[PDB]
Assembly symmetry: D2
Homo-oligomer: 256 residues x 4
């Protein structure tokens, strides 16, 4: 159990050493997995290669995939299959909204900002799952990252809250559709973590303080803690579990 | 309480006599409310006028608003304010997805089909709320229609399930944003009803049969039953209630 | 709709003018309903009679029923049926735990304290429903009062939180069992209100302050607001609604 | 990660080879854990010893603890601490209701039957947690078994449904109370499994058939699958997770 030595996972959404998806990569790597990484723009390839040398993987497998492009997602997973073969799962950690939409009054959200968030943060999972399934003929596990703001209205989270609720339903619909193909689809609801996606978010230290003061474990979580739950979900330990959303958040989801 | 004689409501999404929104109109009308109706295309105006004569309203207030158009939503509510004055609330009953997306494997959903459903079925509430609030300077109530498929993966509901989950989160975010303006925003989760939106949906009679056999009240609900709950939500009876999703479904939501 | 003139409701759990159940009584009374009141101990009868003269009911119908006694519940509803006839519904607002259990560490709860809370705060609904149904041969509506602490762990609520979760499940099981008899069973999740049940609860003003600062309506709710939702639930306006838990809490349930 | 060689767990509620808790024991045992077993009555000791020889544990640690007795729970965990030392966690799989209460109309449930179910199926976790914490001075993990009938009204589950809702809230309150002591408390919501607790349950094969036909994985789960999720929850893989209820049910919780 949990020896991932002959398993291969595609990880999407690493930006830097603080990325939640890099906590996932470190844990899967320590368990022996072969890892494939995707990134949005060619400008990020070098820093990502360099970051990933930390894992000492025998081969650096990196692919430019902008999930806004059908062509890039299809072509990318096809190239992954040609280069590395079939895979055992996908870790999805991609989200975006225009910054102006993460501070406004939500009622002022533009149509374009709303659809943009849905496209990147929710639809991306659907097309990734369809293309990744082609590499998983004997089944596999797909995991997406979410936040409690998809379950409750959190101040400022605004359009991303609606995008995460969409993502969370996307996970259940994919679980239903792909279950017969022995592909499980689950989410991790991570507590707040200081990453690049916290940059420009006002009052972020106040959010971190509230968890510390109120959550059952009276502390915040980190990327490795999300990564350990991701290993469980990506592995056969979680074989009977699908369409689930596991909170890795020091118990915050359970209190009011 | 519940005398709606000096109140005005805008109702969006009546297609015909079987529309859920027409059950809402009949109940509000019987309570004495003045009603304003919107419709998508000019081709539908005459049948809608004719249908609405059944309510014997002293004045027929009807406006062409395609919620896919920012201009039409802004201009429409502005014209409503000029013609009838301030309003007390809005009933939103608008949803759409391409039919091909309501029978597929969900994983095969196109980007365009996904975003289309989000645009009409979820974003429409956001822009309607922003424009309607301009007519509600002393506050008001906004109600949207949803389905259990936004909370759970239901077979075939597919892209509409993700759109309804988005709508349901939209309701909570709007409730948070507009609460300080004394505007409440709530949803009704209606059980299945044979309307125009059931047309082409395979196995619809099987869905109706399952409710009859399994729901606590052992019967299906109707449009007037949704309308009675909509009156409660649109009126001051529900003054302490916002961001809520009330199931009008014979108890089906409560069983498994 | 909502003319309750030829309807009779039994209200259980009024202690004084601040009781949530008295907000319910005032609203139902203003709607024209005939009301029957129960109370635990004979010592409370006079103050309750006096309090209830405020409603100017043509007849004072009051019954001593300690819900810990099967005999008193059976005999009480039987006497109600003999004196007033069949009823249209029951409003249940009864809860108790030993004070020592509402401040402890929850893990230190005694077996006796735990079972006491379950007995009064949850089982009471089950036996009341069974005895009340005998007075509702053409159907009716039963409503119970709950708190968000039954859905989430709230500090200090402790054994009452477990008792309310039990009550909330009791409501769904009763809804399923009694639905075929056209008896609906629902809960109201009231926000915090300064009543006799807040007495001795440390930090209660802090709880009230958090709602004011964080809930969508940025204010606390009152007993009349709960009473207006109770009228909706007790009346035919809510005819398609059962096993539901409606939050009357300024939207607090919808945020995090 | 997940090497449980220097860890000790107490497992409560094994009846025979089909017990969910025995699936838990097999998985933890294969991971290298030392196991301690409890049982209700001395009559069961021999069959349990014999069953447990299958695990080839170097020492057979078995204790008679009837969770209805405060003395037996306190004395039992105290004896466990004296014999084996500190422990790393507890797996709780104990439930009971009178059979007459699992087929009735729920509204006919006796006070004694209701409280009995609460006592064994819910309060037992509270006292076990308080006594077990004494053996976990550096922290630990407590896991309880639940069923979807604690979240929704399932036909016939009746008083056990209310008992499981109570258990599920018990888990959140314990998580809050014990979090500062670095003790995590979580539940597993297992899908239906043919065990001794299915004996006498009418229509059990129909329940199993519905999962197979409707759940995302289109199959039922087994005791080992619950055991693998229990290993995750009992180990440090789940370090940021508490007050959670993980569904091991082929995705059934996610559909309607
Ligand atoms: N940071 C937090 O507090 C939490 C974040 N989350 C969620 O976790 C996920 C990842 O968050 P992060 O905080 O680790 O984000 P960050 O470190 O900024 O990584 C964002 C990645 O998302 C990528 N990304 C963003 N947009 C796109 C796109 N259109 N196509 C492809 N990738 C895109 C972004 O470029 C970048 O990856 P690449 O460098 O591989 O491209 C997101 O889904 C986020 O919503 C959940 C709970 C708490
Ligand atoms: N029928 C059912 O089983 C249930 C439906 N619902 C929901 O109820 C709402 C209304 O459903 P309905 O079943 O009454 O739908 P229907 O009678 O077909 O009315 C649809 C309306 O939605 C309108 N509509 C659709 N797309 C658009 C658009 N882009 N802009 C403006 N209006 C649009 C459509 O034209 C039409 O109204 P107008 O004739 O006023 O335009 C929808 O939100 C639907 O998702 C919920 C539970 C159960
Ligand atoms: N106060 C609050 O913040 C909230 C209370 N609630 C709930 O509302 C319900 C009523 O609360 P309250 O705050 O109005 O309580 P209070 O005004 O103290 O009334 C308590 C009643 O509950 C009665 N009661 C208590 N125990 C028993 C018993 N064993 N048998 C019969 N009645 C019992 C108590 O005596 C008394 O009524 P009578 O005077 O009619 O007997 C309770 O179920 C409570 O848990 C919910 C949300 C917020
Ligand atoms: N079987 C199923 O379909 C499911 C069961 N569950 C739950 O799983 C748990 C265990 O179920 P099981 O189906 O494995 O039950 P079974 O194999 O009959 O074991 C019951 C144990 O619970 C014990 N038990 C029962 N009552 C008591 C008591 N008062 N004190 C101490 N132990 C008690 C019973 O004796 C026996 O253990 P011991 O032989 O160690 O004593 C229960 O909490 C049950 O509610 C959840 C989902 C699906
Ligand atoms: C917590 C929390 C986060 C972290 N989190 C859970 C997120 O999901 C962040 C998602 C995100 C998506 N798009 C952008 C940004 C963040 C900032 C930079 C940018 O230009 N676009 O973001 C918030 C935004 C507002 C309020 C709270 C939060
Ligand atoms: C129930 C139920 C409904 C009713 N319902 C709750 C809905 O929300 C229907 C929404 C809907 C949206 N767009 C379209 C259609 C229906 C049919 C005609 C069309 O061209 N587009 O629709 C289903 C579709 C699949 C499965 C179940 C259901
Ligand atoms: C809010 C809130 C309440 C109000 N509420 C929702 C309740 O349900 C109160 C229930 C209650 C039950 N039994 C007793 C008392 C209160 C105080 C007096 C007594 O001797 N026993 O009580 C709390 C107790 C602790 C923490 C928060 C709260
Ligand atoms: C599923 C399912 C189960 C399995 N399950 C999840 C359970 O939790 C069973 C719990 C249980 C508790 N007490 C007793 C029994 C079973 C049968 C023997 C006895 O004398 N008492 O039990 C049901 C009972 C009715 C309906 C469905 C179910």
């Amino acid at each position: 159990m949990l020896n991932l030595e002959n398993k291969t996972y595609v990880i999407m959404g690493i930006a830097n050493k603080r990325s939640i998806a890099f906590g996932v990569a470190k844990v899967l790597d320590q368990l022996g997995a072969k890892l494939v990484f995707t990134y949005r723009k060619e400008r990020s390839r070098k820093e990502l290669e360099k970051l990933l040398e930390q894992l000492n993987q025998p081969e650096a497998h990196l692919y430019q995939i902008d999930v806004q492009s059908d062509e890039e997602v299809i072509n990318g997973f096809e190239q992954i299959g040609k280069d590395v073969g079939n895979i055992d799962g996908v870790y999805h950690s991609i989200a975006f909204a225009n910054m102006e939409d993460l501070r406004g009054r939500f009622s002022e959200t533009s149509r374009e900002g709303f659809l943009l968030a849905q496209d990147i943060s929710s639809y991306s999972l659907t097309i990734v799952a369809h293309e990744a399934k082609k590499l998983m003929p004997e089944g596999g596990s797909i995991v997406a990252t979410t936040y409690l703001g998809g379950e409750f209205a959190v101040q400022n989270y605004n359009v991303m809250g609606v995008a995460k609720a969409s993502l969370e339903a996307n996970v259940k619909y994919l679980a239903l559709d792909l279950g017969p193909d022995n592909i499980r689809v689950n989410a991790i609801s991570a507590g707040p973590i200081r990453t690049l996606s916290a940059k420009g978010v006002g009052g972020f230290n106040t959010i971190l303080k509230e968890i510390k003061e109120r959550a059952p474990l009276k502390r915040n979580v980190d990327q490795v803690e999300v990564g350990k739950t991701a290993a469980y979900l990506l592995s056969d330990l979680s074989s009977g579990v699908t369409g689930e959303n596991i909170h890795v958040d020091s118990g915050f989801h359970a209190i009011k």
